[PDB]
Design an enzyme around this catalytic site. Structure first.
Site, PDB file in Angstrom:
ATOM      1  CD  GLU A  13       1.038  32.335 -32.018  1.00 22.36           C
ATOM      2  OE1 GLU A  13       0.718  31.345 -32.707  1.00 22.36           O
ATOM      3  OE2 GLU A  13       1.669  32.242 -30.943  1.00 22.36           O
ATOM      4  CE  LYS A  39      -8.998  -2.584   0.217  1.00 24.91           C
ATOM      5  NZ  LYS A  39      -9.834  -1.644   1.016  1.00 24.91           N
ATOM      6  CE  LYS A  91      -4.501  -1.276   1.951  1.00 20.86           C
ATOM      7  NZ  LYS A  91      -5.585  -0.766   2.838  1.00 20.86           N
ATOM      8  CG  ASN A 123       5.035  33.576 -32.698  1.00 18.79           C
ATOM      9  OD1 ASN A 123       4.353  33.377 -33.704  1.00 18.79           O
ATOM     10  ND2 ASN A 123       4.888  32.868 -31.585  1.00 18.79           N
ATOM     11  CB  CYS A 165       3.072  30.067 -33.463  1.00 17.85           C
ATOM     12  SG  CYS A 165       3.580  28.960 -32.128  1.00 17.85           S
ATOM     13  CD  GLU A 224      -1.885  19.982 -31.785  1.00 22.84           C
ATOM     14  OE1 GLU A 224      -1.453  18.813 -31.878  1.00 22.84           O
ATOM     15  OE2 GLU A 224      -1.553  20.894 -32.571  1.00 22.84           O
ATOM     16  NE  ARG A 284      -4.283 -12.528   3.795  1.00 25.35           N
ATOM     17  CZ  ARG A 284      -4.335 -13.710   4.397  1.00 25.35           C
ATOM     18  NH1 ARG A 284      -5.391 -14.497   4.230  1.00 25.35           N
ATOM     19  NH2 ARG A 284      -3.330 -14.110   5.163  1.00 25.35           N
ATOM     20  CB  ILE A 285      -3.533  -9.881  -3.864  1.00 24.23           C
ATOM     21  CG1 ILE A 285      -4.282  -9.351  -5.088  1.00 24.23           C
ATOM     22  CG2 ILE A 285      -3.692 -11.389  -3.744  1.00 24.23           C
ATOM     23  CD1 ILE A 285      -3.873 -10.003  -6.393  1.00 24.23           C
ATOM     24  CB  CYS A 325       3.102  38.364 -27.257  1.00 26.90           C
ATOM     25  SG  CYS A 325       2.843  36.631 -27.626  1.00 26.90           S
ATOM     26  CE1 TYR A 361       3.766  27.812 -37.194  1.00 29.56           C
ATOM     27  CE2 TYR A 361       2.170  26.179 -36.480  1.00 29.56           C
ATOM     28  CZ  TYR A 361       3.361  26.849 -36.295  1.00 29.56           C
ATOM     29  OH  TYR A 361       4.150  26.552 -35.207  1.00 29.56           O
ATOM     30  CE1 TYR A 362       5.067  23.238 -38.544  1.00 30.74           C
ATOM     31  CE2 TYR A 362       3.302  22.509 -37.103  1.00 30.74           C
ATOM     32  CZ  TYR A 362       4.633  22.800 -37.311  1.00 30.74           C
ATOM     33  OH  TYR A 362       5.534  22.650 -36.281  1.00 30.74           O
ATOM     34  CB  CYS A 377       7.722  32.582 -28.374  1.00 35.82           C
ATOM     35  SG  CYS A 377       6.156  33.381 -28.792  1.00 35.82           S
ATOM     36  CG  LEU A 403      -9.358 -10.545  -7.238  1.00 33.12           C
ATOM     37  CD1 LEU A 403      -9.917 -11.382  -8.378  1.00 33.12           C
ATOM     38  CD2 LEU A 403      -7.890 -10.222  -7.474  1.00 33.12           C
TER      39      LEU A 403
END
Ligand SMILES: Nc1ncnc2c1ncn2[C@H]1C[C@H](O)[C@@H](COP(=O)(O)OP(=O)(O)OP(=O)(O)O)O1
Ligand SMILES: Nc1ncnc2c1ncn2[C@H]1C[C@H](O)[C@@H](COP(=O)(O)OP(=O)(O)OP(=O)(O)O)O1
Ligand SMILES: Nc1ncnc2c1ncn2[C@H]1C[C@H](O)[C@@H](COP(=O)(O)OP(=O)(O)O)O1
Ligand SMILES: [Mg+2]
Lengths: 34, 733
Positions: B438, B18, B6, B434, B436, B620, B13-14, B459, B727-728, B222, B16
């Site tokens: 933006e 729990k 614990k 920057n 990104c 993200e 003893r184990i 920023c 961007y990308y 950044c 199940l």
């Protein structure tokens, strides 16, 4: 139905139960106004 | 027969049960979810003496994989399991300790800043503990909880032990931000702002979600740095990088001022060695704290397209080329203006000059459009200036080529940045982006690491959860409750560089964007391709911008307008609704709901506490918390997979049980004419540049190849609607 409707409690039981294009045209883009 | 260890360190003893009890709990109120599934999926492998903490951690990762389109609920199941596990390492129990005891203990441990006790009293902490609602930890998702667990929560790096809960984070971060506020409204804002970030109404950057209430005053995501054509400036710019990179902040270099190779130095005492040689020095500076030499520190270098070494800079990220002339560890952003595209359409050639050879030609490029077309055409006929003729059709192809292979080569329309920007192209013109892409804030070259005249554009990021507000009018509260928090932060944080502080306190610019845009259109039953949201997008953002300015406006009277403001167009009674791309009146007719002429007179008197208030950025990490769609980017799939840091996490889109049809998955759109068409409309109310990225699926084109015809098409289409940067360029793999 005697018992209440329910989602299956053990879905696992079902597992055992079965390049770049280079093309350029000036005329086609010349019609596009900026 | 087997035993378990614990948490406290006791052994029994184990049993199940729990595990059954626990899983049965988090499964309460859920459907299509089965307890047995997790247990077997877990393939948990008992073995004599096993720590109970490990057993818990194994079941969590199990129910984590369950998350699927058929049975999404799982991602609340795992989340519930994760929080339960976190409460153990943080407080040793589920029921959290008193807000006041918790801060006290931590301060003695050196976790939270000791100012929290010097700014607030014990009698107040007990008053703030009431606003707290630990029951809000269940409103999270596995994708969100997983993030907080890894990074956001104040936890030991060496041991890995947690020290606080998700709620204690919001309650504290808001409180520190309003610490320097009047005792009459100090506690007030602490509540509203708290019930604004915990309720997923406002998203805050990673450096903020982690830091405030941490001794560190470094919250800069950044830094934009403008390097000049000098050895002294280069070293200063290089040192400026090593400073922020160690702080894990994006970097935005412009070397675009560095003379081309062969250029004479000091009359002719020596010839320039080239740009590539210096570009590398910048990379190592960004990798100086990167582990291995590989990963971390992201820095985008910009430069003009009419540059002489442009052809040698576009292929930098390309393998072929012995390192001698290569840079694959840094992003780039080719700056383009009206004239450039003109030469392309007419299939005419572009002259490749050098910054030193063509005086004023460089400045004309951003601050003034007409002067550029006069000087350019002038230096072309002049034979006493080294140049080079290149077909505009070829140059633009070589760019999109490396852009399609790497997908890092960004585009920046400097003409639009200075055409419709708060900054005056004459006093403080935009000549940078920057990492990104933006941000669009003025910059100045530094003569040294501590140069005063220098100006490091900084920023503060933030965003509004469109999928949290009922109407656009609700932004009225969020705006004021957001601008203040960020504005105060600018004074709460420090600046390791003079130039940085100069621009920070000078115009006090801020960058507030939007998140969960995909879900927003989903509710209103709109899409991208068809463009049945052009009007909606116009109305929505119209308010987002109105309230932001109206917020920074009232703030100005209370604390005054930014010191450098006279520079900004807002001072001369100029609003984005005037310098916007007039070509937007062909894709939307949505009239102004809000009476700006009113704000015009209001700002023309008191001004704005900040120079820039609206930024759209790709978020993200931040969005994952609100379990919303990253920025304005449409969901790649109903159950997008994000892998971080150690393992990918399944994040199901918001309200999937009722929105399945509505969503228009990224891959699924015909083209970009619809997407970019919306970005141009948004930019109409953005003081700053949206990090819009293109998309191309070789499966939709013949011969399974993306034609260059379409690439240039969208590029021009975007420019037509005032799209500042790109961007990308995600290519379906
Ligand atoms: N004796 C046990 N045998 C098998 N699994 C156990 C046993 N005790 C606890 N577990 C499981 C239950 C949970 O899923 C997981 C974590 O238990 P956890 O509650 O976090 O620590 P804990 O054992 O100190 O508190 P608690 O006494 O309430 O279970 O381990
Ligand atoms: N010995 C050198 N070898 C390679 N590059 C150099 C050398 N000296 C200067 N450069 C580069 C660095 C900068 O990009 C640019 C100008 O540097 P800089 O120090 O400003 O020259 P300078 O101040 O001595 O005279 P000037 O700038 O007026 O030509 O040329
Ligand atoms: N390697 C890195 N580590 C931390 N932040 C980074 C980074 N590279 C870029 N960024 C930042 C800089 C950007 O201004 C910012 C834009 O998106 P963001 O939503 O603010 O990030 P996040 O999702 O972490 O909150 O991410
Ligand atoms: Mg010089």
């Amino acid at each position: 139905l005697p018992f209440q409707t329910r989602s299956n409690p053990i879905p696992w039981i079902n597992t055992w139960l079965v390049q770049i294009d280079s093309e350029v045209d000036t005329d086609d883009l010349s019609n596009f106004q900026l | 027969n087997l035993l378990v260890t614990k948490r406290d360190g006791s052994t029994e003893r184990i049993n199940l049960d729990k595990i059954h009890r626990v899983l049965d709990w988090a499964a309460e109120g859920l459907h299509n979810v089965s307890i047995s599934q997790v247990e077997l999926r877990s393939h948990i492998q008992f073995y004599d003496g096993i720590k109970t903490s490990d057993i818990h951690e194994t079941i969590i990762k199990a129910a984590a994989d369950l998350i699927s389109r058929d049975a999404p609920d799982y991602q609340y199941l795992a989340a519930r399991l994760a929080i339960f596990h976190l409460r153990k390492k943080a407080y040793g129990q589920f029921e959290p300790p008193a807000l006041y005891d918790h801060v006290v203990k931590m301060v003695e441990m050196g976790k939270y800043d000791n100012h929290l006790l010097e700014d607030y009293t014990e009698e107040e902490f007990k008053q703030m503990d009431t606003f707290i609602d630990h029951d809000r930890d269940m409103t999270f998702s596995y994708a969100a909880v997983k993030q907080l667990e890894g990074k956001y929560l104040v936890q030991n790096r060496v041991t890995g032990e947690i020290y606080e809960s998700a709620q204690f984070l919001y309650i504290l971060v808001a409180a520190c931000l309003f610490s320097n506020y009047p005792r009459e409204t100090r506690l007030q804002y602490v509540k509203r702002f708290y019930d604004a970030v915990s309720t997923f109404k406002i998203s805050l950057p990673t450096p903020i979600m982690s830091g405030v209430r941490t001794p560190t005053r470094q919250f800069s995501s950044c830094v934009l740095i403008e390097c000049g054509d000098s050895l002294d400036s280069i070293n200063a710019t290089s040192s400026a990088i090593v400073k922020y990179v160690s702080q894990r902040a994006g970097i935005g270099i412009n070397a675009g001022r560095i003379r081309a190779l062969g250029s004479p130095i000091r009359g002719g005492e020596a010839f320039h060695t080239g740009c590539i040689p210096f570009y590398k020095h910048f990379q190592t500076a960004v990798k100086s704290c990167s582990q291995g030499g590989v990963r971390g520190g992201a820095a985008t270098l910009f430069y003009p397209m009419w540059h002489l070494e442009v052809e040698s800079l576009l292929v930098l990220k390309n393998n072929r080329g012995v390192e001698g002339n290569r840079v694959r560890h840094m992003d780039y952003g080719v700056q383009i203006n009206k004239l450039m595209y003109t030469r392309l359409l007419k299939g005419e050639d572009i002259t490749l000059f050098s910054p030193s050879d063509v005086p004023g030609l460089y400045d004309a490029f951003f601050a003034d459009q007409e002067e550029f077309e006069r000087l350019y055409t002038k230096y072309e006929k002049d034979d006493s200036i080294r140049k080079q003729r290149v077909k505009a059709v070829e140059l633009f192809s070589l760019m999109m080529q490396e852009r399609a292979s790497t997908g890092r080569i960004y585009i920046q329309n400097v003409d639009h940045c200075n055409t419709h920007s708060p900054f005056d192209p004459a006093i403080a013109p935009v000549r940078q982006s920057n990492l990104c892409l933006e941000i669009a804030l003025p910059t100045k070259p530094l003569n040294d690491v501590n140069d005063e005249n220098g100006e490091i554009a900084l920023c503060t990021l933030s965003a509004f959860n469109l999928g949290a507000i009922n109407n656009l009018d609700e932004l009225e509260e969020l705006a004021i409750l957001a601008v203040r928090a960020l504005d105060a932060l600018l004074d709460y944080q420090d600046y390791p560089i003079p130039a940085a502080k100069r621009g920070a306190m000078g115009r006090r610019t801020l960058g507030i964007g939007v998140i969960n845009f995909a879900y927003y259109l989903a509710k209103h039953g709109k899409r991208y391709s068809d463009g049945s949201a052009n009007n909606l997008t116009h109305k929505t953002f119209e308010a987002i911008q109105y309230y932001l300015l109206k917020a920074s406006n009232e703030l100005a009277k209370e604390q005054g307008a930014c010191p450098w403001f006279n520079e900004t167009t807002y001072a001369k009674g100029i609003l984005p609704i005037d310098t916007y791309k007039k070509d937007l009146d062909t894709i939307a007719n949505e009239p102004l709901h809000y009476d700006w002429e009113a704000l015009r007179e209001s700002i023309k008197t008191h001004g704005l506490r900040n120079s820039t208030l609206s930024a759209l950025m790709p978020s993200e990490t931040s969005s994952q918390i609100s379990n919303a769609t990253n920025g304005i980017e449409p969901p790649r799939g109903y159950v997008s997979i994000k892998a971080s840091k150690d393992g990918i996490l399944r994040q199901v889109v918001p309200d999937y049980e009722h929105l399945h049809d509505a969503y228009e998955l990224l891959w699924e759109m015909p083209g970009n004419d619809g997407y970019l068409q919306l970005v141009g409309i948004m930019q109409k109310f953005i003081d700053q540049s949206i990090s819009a990225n293109t998309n191309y699926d070789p499966s939709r084109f013949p011969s399974g190849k993306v034609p260059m015809q379409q690439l240039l098409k969208d590029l021009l289409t975007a420019y037509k609607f005032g799209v500042k940067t790109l961007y990308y360029q995600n290519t379906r793999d």
